[model samples]
Target: MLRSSLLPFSYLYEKIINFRNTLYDKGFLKIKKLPVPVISVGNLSVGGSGKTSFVMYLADLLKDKRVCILSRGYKRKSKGTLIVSEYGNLKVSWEEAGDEPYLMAKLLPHVSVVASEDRYKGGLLALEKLSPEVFILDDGFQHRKLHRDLNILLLKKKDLKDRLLPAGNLREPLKEIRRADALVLTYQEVEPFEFFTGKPTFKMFREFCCLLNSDFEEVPFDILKEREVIAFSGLGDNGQFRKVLKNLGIKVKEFMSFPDHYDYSDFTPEEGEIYLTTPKDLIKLQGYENVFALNFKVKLEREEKLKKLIYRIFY
Candidate 1:
């Protein structure tokens, strides 16, 4: 119902975006390139493009290399350059680091994760302190200020044909794909694996992984095995979350779907019930009791092929 009502604004939205793109294209607006190689994972949509999972995929594939994950720490309170140090080793808290970065720190323990509204400064900081061999800029494709050696644009299978925002969720037109080095389709399983098959592409199938608590401890997927439980998420898409739980043989009793980046202060736990959510929901869930967030990653079936494509940018 709401989506239909927003359709009228599509023309206005597209015009604004086109104006911005023109400025960038004409070089009137400058994009600064970093000294080190940068791989950017971003999308044309507003949210739920499986960016976090792709970052995990990169972190896993490049586990042997010293890599730093940089983000703006969306909705996080801390300002200026902040490096998220897990296990009580740094001043940055979950409140400051943003849930996704904190979760990334836990998931990819070997790699360093840092946050800054000014990502350029964050990249410089990571380079000076960690001297990482490679840098993965999270949700940074539209951030034209930073030059990327390679751009990996992701899209959810369900939203491929959607209209541009605020009429629909798409941030830019599908035609802007020409700017990307490669396309990644995530959070779905289907064949042909390519939206624009003529261009290079990869498909990442999403599956249920063990949920994690605030302490970064894993909860067995079987814990909710055969049980009816409520699912909660502040992600752009709730369908993927539901599909994952259902695939694990768990029945969702109910789901509280909040807006992406929703900050909840009144979420409370129920007895003998599971409070499941996505990793992005963690920062807002600090004071809320009795909620668990699921940490998901893209498991590439073919490691050698994925690795070769990623390294091709730098080599």
Candidate 2:
């Protein structure tokens, strides 16, 4: 409960990160390069920077090109580098692929998804099997082992004021963001925040597209907003999910928070009770009848500019 208890741990985390960076710089640790150009979407904060939404947005833009997304599949039960999808087709279940990767597979059927503990190995496997022209590394900012051609950092205004992990939410301190190739400010309400940076900067905004039932049928909000919902999410930012529900005018009776990438094997649902969660979590909540997922999309300001940046990498 005391902030003092975690400061030491945060300090340790900071030192390790710095040392790791130095090791890479000194060539003691080799940063492996993939044959295809790699673009990464990650955040300074531990969770809820809208990394998933941003990745989907990027993948959609590159759908014409063969795209393979390499992810760690955080908290999954499976082991080693596994191909989650091949050419818009699912090769494994959500449990095998992890929730976010599975969710991405179903939503962006054009994009191939792979989950691995060691992303560089995963990238190689994807290349061998899928022959993708480009790879988008999900949550790979700290994963420096795989050299990234475009490193995009996602941040919310709240994250800008946060401290390093254990004591706070950041994985790295603010000054460390200078390492990023681009900056994206998300969760803006009115006007987008003005952040001065020499790096190419962008703004991201999210909108509730719709809700889908167990069958993936679009559920009307007119009916959903009237019901008392048991909203639950196991994600990096459960609090942000609650904020989103509030903005959508959902009548939430109770909210359940679980650790990020929560394996819901022990989860029990009340018969006939309605449930609401993000698509990321919904992939894991299979067999739950009344549960629904909120479909959300991330929109970038001047996406053509970001497109040009990605295009530059290709040519």
Candidate 3:
């Protein structure tokens, strides 16, 4: 019902987005090229396109290199550019640096992570301080001001039928996907995306890596087997988290979803209920008991081909 009501506004939204892109394409909007190579991971939709996981995947592939990640720090409490991680040392709390950067800083200790509203300034700051060999712009396809060497877009099967924002979840029109250098399909089979977009396509899936206690100690994955658990997350796509648990044979008694990047300051878990969540949420809920984070890793199909492309671009 809401979708129907907002359909008219989508038309207006599409026009505005197209105009902005046109300005960038025509050189009216200046695009800045940094000294180092920049690889962007983004999506057309507003929700999770497996971006964070994919970024981690890239960091793993290029683990030997000096890679720095830049994020917009969406909903963070701090202002101005801040370095979340500097050469394996974290400088800010999750509240100040934002959850995604904090989690990345914690997990990928060898890589550097920085957050800022103005990515161009953030990139400059990272270059000056970290002297990174490569910059991974988190959610950067729409951030056209920073010229990138490669633009990778992630898409879900449902996104094919989605309309523009205010009516649907798309941040831009579906056709704009052609601008992506490569396409990644998440939680779905790779269909004819390459055929349509004329770009290389790959498939990706998430697999449970481990479960972590409040202290970050590993808990066996079998602990969740046959147990009634309450799963929750403050993610763009919490459904995917729940789906993984169900697929693993864990009985989810209740699955709750909060807004994306929700601060869990006031959230109190139900007494005696076992809880599970993503690492993004665990960083905030660490002190609470009975809460364990489900850590997952992204597995890319045709990873060698993807790696070769990345190596060719950066080497």
Supply every candidate's count of residue pairs whose N, Cα or C atoms clash at under 3 angstroms: 0, 1, 0
For model 3, the superposed segments whose C-alpha errors exceed 4 Å read 189-196, 215-219, 225-243, 251-274, 287-290
Q: Judge candidate 3 at residue 255 and give its lDDT.
A: 87
Residues 82-120, model 3: lDDT tens digits: 999996688989878877678877767688998988888
| Candidate order, TM-score descending | 3, 2, 1
Identify the superior model by lDDT, candidate 1 or candidate 2: 2
Across residues 187-292, which tens digit of lDDT does each residue of candidate 1 receive? 6554324476575677778655677775556666666666677888886548877876666666778988887756676666677676777766765565444567
What are the RMSD figures for all models against the true structure?
Answer: 3.9, 3.2, 3.2
Top lDDT model: 2
List residue ranges in candidate 1 displaced over 4 A: 1-8, 86-90, 190-193, 224-244, 251-277, 281-292, 301-303
Candidate 1 whole-model C-alpha lDDT, 0 to 1: 0.74
Please provide TM-scores, in order, for all candidate models, with all chains considered together: 0.80, 0.85, 0.86
Q: Runs in model 2 with CA error above 4 Å?
A: 190-192, 215-243, 251-275, 287-290
lDDT of each: 0.74, 0.84, 0.83
- The CA root-mean-square deviation of candidate 2, after full C-alpha superposition on the true structure, stands at 3.2
Q: After TM-score superposition, what is the CA distance of residue 280 in candidate 3 from its true location, in Å?
A: 2.9
Q: Write the per-residue lDDT of candidate 2 for residues 20-67, one digit (tens) a residue.
A: 877876789889999889998888887666787788899988877999
